[PDB]
């Protein structure tokens, strides 16, 4: 009766490993597309169903490979995931917001046939690392039709994003590049009080925790995307009445439970 429901009843353990869908990759050449630097698409095979689309941005100096594990992880749980390369490695967060927007337009309109075959063009979301997480907050502000936004150890000089898109922010306790007291936690506080929002803080984690396989980032990112992109309420259990020793802080307005 939920037409967007995919995959088996989830367990926390299952969300710390690649999920039930086999994954394809398609490399987008830089010169093949306008408005972003290409990147990599991760998408399901072995299926007739369609899935929400996620565009994800890496951070300053970084490329799509810095989030390859997470693009694969998300796609293997039932998503079409485009991890962008930026026009320049030195692009700022608002430039990365524009590039996520171009990437999502590309995904819905001129991506390969096999990608288009797996995409529900009306169910889209964003995520990103560091300045890519600041871009994630900005694109959410600019596009209220987005279903969800997951900034990972986000960095931005602007602290207030007027978005109605449900936001889950991951902070890293030991982050020296985007300290949670100056970036992640202000972003969380300044989001409208009427927007569903969660902040989780990883115990002992550095700014580069998102660039390696990370059980907590996998669980919270998959769960937020499933709940909002797929309306999959089977994932509320991971975001409500949370007991997880990987987390050293948790804030929410409880609009997702």
Curated annotation (Swiss-Prot):
GO CC, alphabetical: extracellular region
Keywords: Disulfide bond, Hydrolase, Secreted, Serine esterase, Signal
Transmembrane segments: none
pH dependence: Optimum pH is 8.5 with pNP-butyrate as substrate. Shows 70% of the maximal activity at pH 7.0 and pH 9.5.
Main location: secreted
Record EC number: 3.1.1.74, 3.1.1.101
Active site: 130, 175, 207
InterPro entries, sorted: AB_hydrolase_fold, FrsA_esterase, PET_hydrolase/cutinase-like
Temperature notes for this entry: Optimum temperature is 50 degrees Celsius with pNP-butanoate as substrate. Optimum temperature using PET as substrate is superior to 70 degrees Celsius. Shows 70% of the maximal activity at 30 and 70 degrees Celsius with pNP-butyrate as substrate. Has half-lives of 5 hours at 50 degrees Celsius, 80 minutes at 60 degrees Celsius, 40 minutes at 70 degrees Celsius and 7 minutes at 80 degrees Celsius. Is thermostable, with a determined melting temperature (Tm) of 84.7 degrees Celsius.
Disulfide bond sites: 240-257
Pfam family, one: PETase
PTM annotation: The disulfide bond between Cys-240 and Cys-257 contributes not only to the thermodynamic stability but also to the kinetic stability of the enzyme.
Reactions this protein catalyses: cutin + H2O = cutin monomers; (ethylene terephthalate)(n) + H2O = (ethylene terephthalate)(n-1) + 4-[(2-hydroxyethoxy)carbonyl]benzoate + H(+); 4-[(2-hydroxyethoxy)carbonyl]benzoate + H2O = terephthalate + ethylene glycol + H(+); an acetyl ester + H2O = an aliphatic alcohol + acetate + H(+)
PANTHER family, per database record: DIENELACTONE HYDROLASE DOMAIN-CONTAINING PROTEIN-RELATED (PTHR22946), POLYKETIDE TRANSFERASE AF380 (PTHR22946:SF9)
Additional detail: The gene encoding this enzyme comes from a leaf-branch compost metagenome. The source organism remains to be identified. However, it is presumably a thermophilic bacterium.
Function: Catalyzes the hydrolysis of cutin, a polyester that forms the structure of plant cuticle. Shows esterase activity towards p-nitrophenol-linked aliphatic esters (pNP-aliphatic esters), with a preference for short-chain substrates (C4 substrate at most). Cannot hydrolyze olive oil. Is also able to degrade poly(ethylene terephthalate), the most abundant polyester plastic in the world. Can also depolymerize poly(epsilon-caprolactone) (PCL), a synthetic aliphatic biodegradable polyester.
The family this protein is said to belong to: Belongs to the AB hydrolase superfamily.
Protein name: Leaf-branch compost cutinase
UniProt lineage: Bacteria, environmental samples
């Amino acid at each position: 009766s939920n037409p967007y429901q995919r995959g088996p009843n989830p367990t926390r353990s299952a969300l710390t490993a690649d999920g039930p869908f086999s994954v394809r990759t398609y490399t987008i050449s830089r010169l093949s597309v306008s408005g972003f630097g290409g990147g990599v698409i991760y998408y399901p095979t072995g299926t007739s169903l369609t899935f929400g689309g996620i565009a994800m941005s890496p951070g300053y100096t970084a490329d799509a490979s810095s989030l390859a594990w997470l693009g694969r992880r998300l796609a293997s749980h039932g998503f079409v995931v485009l991890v962008i390369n930026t026009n320049s490695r030195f692009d700022g967060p608002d430039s990365r917001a524009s590039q996520l927007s171009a990437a999502l337009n590309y995904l819905r309109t001129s991506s390969p046939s096999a990608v288009r075959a797996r995409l529900d063009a009306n169910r889209l979301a964003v995520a990103g690392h560091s300045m890519g997480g600041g871009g994630t907050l900005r694109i959410a502000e600019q596009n209220p039709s987005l279903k969800a936004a997951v900034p990972l150890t986000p960095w931005h000089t602007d602290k207030t994003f007027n978005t109605s898109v449900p936001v889950l922010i991951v902070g890293a306790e030991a982050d020296t590049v985007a300290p949670v007291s100056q970036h992640a936690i202000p972003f969380y506080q300044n989001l409208p009080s009427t927007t569903p929002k969660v902040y989780v803080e990883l115990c002992n984690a550095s700014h580069i925790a998102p660039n390696s396989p990370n059980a907590a980032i996998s669980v919270y990112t998959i769960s937020w995307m499933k709940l909002w992109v797929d309306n999959d309420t089977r994932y509320r259990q991971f975001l409500c009445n949370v007991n997880d020793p990987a987390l050293c802080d948790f804030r929410t307005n409880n609009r997702h439970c």
